Amino acid sequence: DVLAKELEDVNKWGLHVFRIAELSGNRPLTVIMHTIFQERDLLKTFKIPVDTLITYLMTLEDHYHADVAYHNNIHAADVVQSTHVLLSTPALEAVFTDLEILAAIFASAIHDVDHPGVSNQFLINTNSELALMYNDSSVLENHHLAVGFKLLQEENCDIFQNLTKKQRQSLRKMVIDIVLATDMSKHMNLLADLKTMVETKKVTSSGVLLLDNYSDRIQVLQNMVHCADLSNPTKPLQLYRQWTDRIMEEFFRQGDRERERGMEISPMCDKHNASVEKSQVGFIDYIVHPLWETWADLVHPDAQDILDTLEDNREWYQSTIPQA
Amino acid sequence: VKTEQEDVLAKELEDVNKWGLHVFRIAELSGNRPLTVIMHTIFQERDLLKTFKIPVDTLITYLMTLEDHYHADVAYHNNIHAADVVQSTHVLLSTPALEAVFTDLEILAAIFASAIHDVDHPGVSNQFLINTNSELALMYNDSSVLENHHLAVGFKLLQEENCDIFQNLTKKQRQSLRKMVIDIVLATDMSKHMNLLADLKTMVETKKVTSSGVLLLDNYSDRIQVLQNMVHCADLSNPTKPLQLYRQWTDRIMEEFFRQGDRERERGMEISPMCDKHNASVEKSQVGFIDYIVHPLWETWADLVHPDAQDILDTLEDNREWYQSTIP
Ligand SMILES: COc1ccc(/C=N/OC[C@H](O)CN2C[C@@H](C)O[C@@H](C)C2)cc1OC1CCCC1
Ligand SMILES: COc1ccc(/C=N/OC[C@H](O)CN2C[C@@H](C)O[C@@H](C)C2)cc1OC1CCCC1
Ligand SMILES: [Mg+2]
Ligand SMILES: [Mg+2]
Ligand SMILES: [Mg+2]
Ligand SMILES: [Mg+2]
Ligand SMILES: [Mg+2]
Ligand SMILES: [Zn+2]
Ligand SMILES: [Zn+2]
């Protein structure tokens, strides 16, 4: 019906994911993953029973929190679909193995599962059980990985059951490497290294990137999923506005818990003294544009339309801020 | 004192400041409470209860609970090993080249890290835990699986009734100590040894000393690097001890290794290097251990604190020759 038609846009930047969420009965992660697995022939390639895939996807989606405004199944579905588009970028054609593709997409799907709606720093500062378990280091990201993998153990949920032992081991390593790179405390180091990779990049005659060891390959996959994670401001304004609403709602909820606890309220988490437009322009200027302009460099000119949208949205958000 | 255990014992504890304290004797004389007894002694000696306002009964309660979470049926990675690493770190901290270098909080961190650094060790390796798809390796994504766990347990036990030995630290002190203890225990992961050593060599190359040969450390990076390597050295100090101690440590690690190999053999897995009781060369393996891991590390530490560690290095070399001479 009016879902198969929306899902026709699954290979396009700017898919109406919120509409897909509504139409699927709040199952955007399940429907979008299913669609992409079929589109990429992943069920056949890895002999994944279709009922197993769906069973896993639904239990995974169940473990995203409905009451968390941003870090929920819609965000997961969005990052999955964005990674799916980025994987098909011409500069990367025939570069990645089917296993590497599967790993990037699986990592995207689980990368925020069971997110509590508060930051690593909040969890550390409040002496949470999660921070105790993970010694204050990539607390959330370690946890997302543990839960994501743990769910494969549920009845008829092992989608990787027919991979070889070697394939499963390689897949597990890549997925861990990828989800740990979504920790924002690693952003500047990832970016610094990505800039250096761009500086020294190698391309075939056909113009596709040459990545001849695991380090270079996983580095590209890490940054790709990181870009997808940080892709909201590169989307059409109607979508970007919705993501901004959600992250500010989530932030203000954390800020309210901090205020109640007598804690200093984290930057951008105070509903009373916040500035959304200023916050987004700063987010684009200091994080999202520096990353995406580097990705654009890597795959030039594949990402120029995405960069254009980002730059237009920045100019849009800054337009109502008085300036000299 | 610290444990209502028999007699004394006090004569043995007179060696708490010396390399080659007889920790096994201490374990026996204390009713298998060497970690509690030795930690209590060191905290009193260094006046740490007064400095950090640690109630003595809180200290003893925590130490007993901590000690209870080292497995009695694990041959090597048990409470005696923890006590040994604690006591060895305590000796290393007092080396002349480090006089007045570390704050009392840094000293507390090193000693506390040493005490918890293998707690709840199951007697099998990280690689075994990964290969067998253990819940622990799933929890920690195959990375420093044991060492992350040791830290989690060591800190969690502070929350048991009357166990918070850090209750009278300031918020900042608690935060700093927590970071240092994590940095130190994660550095005991043997997978980090080569990198750790490489960086230690770099530090020795650019080492700054006063005229009395005392190290000049400039910042947290310097201080934590020395503490990480210090506790790593303590962890790898068995072959540098009086031979009778070393011989018992060797017997114990081989027993633990063989038990892991038995588990591997039973599950049809490739038996890990040095874990096959049916095909072992214990003496040869000790010489290889010294040549490729322990001597390169301790020679570098010896350089850092020259000449403070000369005797320790000499003993290492003598002990290498013992195992050499006993290869069949
Ligand atoms: C649409 O906009 C966004 C979309 C995603 C995100 C992604 N956020 O992931 C962050 C983690 O939860 C942790 N941070 C939370 C914060 C309270 O403290 C920081 C130390 C860490 C942010 C967006 O805009 C935001 C940041 C800039 C203005 C609002
Ligand atoms: C007295 O000798 C020793 C004293 C301590 C130790 C400390 N070991 O900690 C290691 C961890 O449990 C994990 N390893 C287990 C092993 C089966 O596989 C490795 C990949 C990692 C070792 C000693 O001897 C060694 C080398 C020669 C005989 C064993
Ligand atoms: Mg995340
Ligand atoms: Mg004597
Ligand atoms: Mg020992
Ligand atoms: Mg250990
Ligand atoms: Mg210095
Ligand atoms: Zn995310
Ligand atoms: Zn140890």
DSSP string over B28-55: HHTTS-HHHHHHHHHHHHTTHHHHHT--
Chain A hits for B152, CB-CB cut-off 8 Å, are 132-135
* Distance spanning both ends of chain B, measured CA to CA: 44
Ion ligand 7: residues, CB < 5 A:
B 218, 222
Find, among A213, A227, A242, the residue nearest to A302 by Cα: A227
Amino acid identity at B51: T
- Cβ atoms of B138 and A150 within 8 Å: the answer is yes
Angle at B46 between CA B240 and CA B121, to 5 degrees: 50
Q: Which two tokens stand for residue A173?
A: 């390593």
CA distance A229 to A247: 13
Domains, chain B: 1-328 (1.10.1300.10)
Find, among B250, B191, B206, B200, the residue nearest to B230 by Cα: B200
Helix or strand or coil: residue A209? Answer: strand
- Cβ atoms of B88 and B21 within 8 Å: the answer is no
Angle at B235 between CA B233 and CA B241, to 5 degrees: 80
Choose one of A269, A283, A291 to mutate for the ligand 1 pocket test, by most ligand atoms within 8 angstroms of C-beta.
A283
Active-site hit among B40, B77, B150, B232: B77
Helix or strand or coil: residue B215? Answer: strand
CA-nearest residue, atom 6 of ligand 2:
B253
A145 touches chain B (CB under 8 A): yes
Q: What are phi and psi of B209, to 5 degrees?
A: -130, 155
Could you say which DSSP state residue B192 is in?
Answer: G
- A173 to B143: CB separation less than 8 angstroms, yes or no: no
Q: How many CB atoms lie within 10 A of CB B192?
A: 16
Helices (H), B117-192: 126-131, 135-139, 145-156, 171-186
Answer positive or negative: Cα dihedral of B199, B227, B87, B15: positive
Indicate the angle between helix axes B220-235 and B171-186, nearest 10 degrees: 50
Cis ω for the linkage preceding B9 (within 30 of 0)? yes
CA distance B46 to B55: 15
Query: What DSSP element (H or E) covers A186?
Result: none
Choose one of B85, B125, B236 to mutate for the ligand 2 pocket test, by most ligand atoms within 8 angstroms of C-beta.
B125
List all residues 6 or more positions away from A218 whose beta carbon is below 8 Å from its beta carbon. A174, A177, A178
Q: Does the annotation count B77 as an active-site position?
A: yes
Reported as half-sphere exposure (CB side, CA atoms, 13 A), residue B84 has a value of 27
Find, among A122, A106, A193, the residue nearest to A157 by Cα: A106
CA distance B67 to B120: 9
Amino acid identity at B10: A
| Strand partners for B215 | B209
- Cβ atoms of A77 and A45 within 8 Å: the answer is no
Residue whose tokens read 């909080």: B105
- Cβ atoms of B36 and B3 within 8 Å: the answer is yes
Answer positive or negative: Cα dihedral of A204, A206, A208, A211: negative
Answer positive or negative: Cα dihedral of B114, B30, B160, B53: negative
Q: Which two tokens stand for residue B307?
A: 């000449």
Find, among A215, A185, A235, the residue nearest to A79 by Cα: A235
Identify the experimental approach.
Answer: X-ray
Q: Which two tokens stand for residue B295?
A: 């001597």
Residue count (chain A): 324
CA distance B323 to B250: 10
Helices (H), chain A: 17-23, 28-39, 42-45, 50-62, 73-87, 98-110, 120-125, 129-133, 139-150, 165-180, 187-199, 214-229, 237-260, 276-283, 289-298, 304-318
A274 burial level (CB within 10 Å; 0-12, 13-18, 19+) = middle
A8 burial level (CB within 10 Å; 0-12, 13-18, 19+) = exposed
Residue of A nearest to B154 (CA): A132
B30 CA to centre of own chain:
20
Find, among A141, A107, A102, A139, the residue nearest to A124 by Cα: A139
Size of interface A-B (CB pairs under 8 A): 32
For the stretch B29-61, what's the b/e string if a residue is b when 16 or more beta carbons lie within 10 angstroms of its beta carbon? bbebbbbbbbbbbbbeebebbeebebeeebbbb
CA distance B232 to B196: 9
CA distance A104 to A94: 15
- Cβ atoms of A68 and A253 within 8 Å: the answer is no
List all residues 6 or more positions away from B94 whose beta carbon is below 8 Å from its beta carbon. B17
CA distance B160 to B3: 19
Chain B hits for A142, CB-CB cut-off 8 Å, are 140-141
Chain A hits for B156, CB-CB cut-off 8 Å, are 132
- B141 to A146: CB separation less than 8 angstroms, yes or no: yes
Which residues surround ligand 1 with Cβ inside 6 Å? A 119, 121, 184, 232, 243-244, 247, 251, 266, 268-269, 279, 283
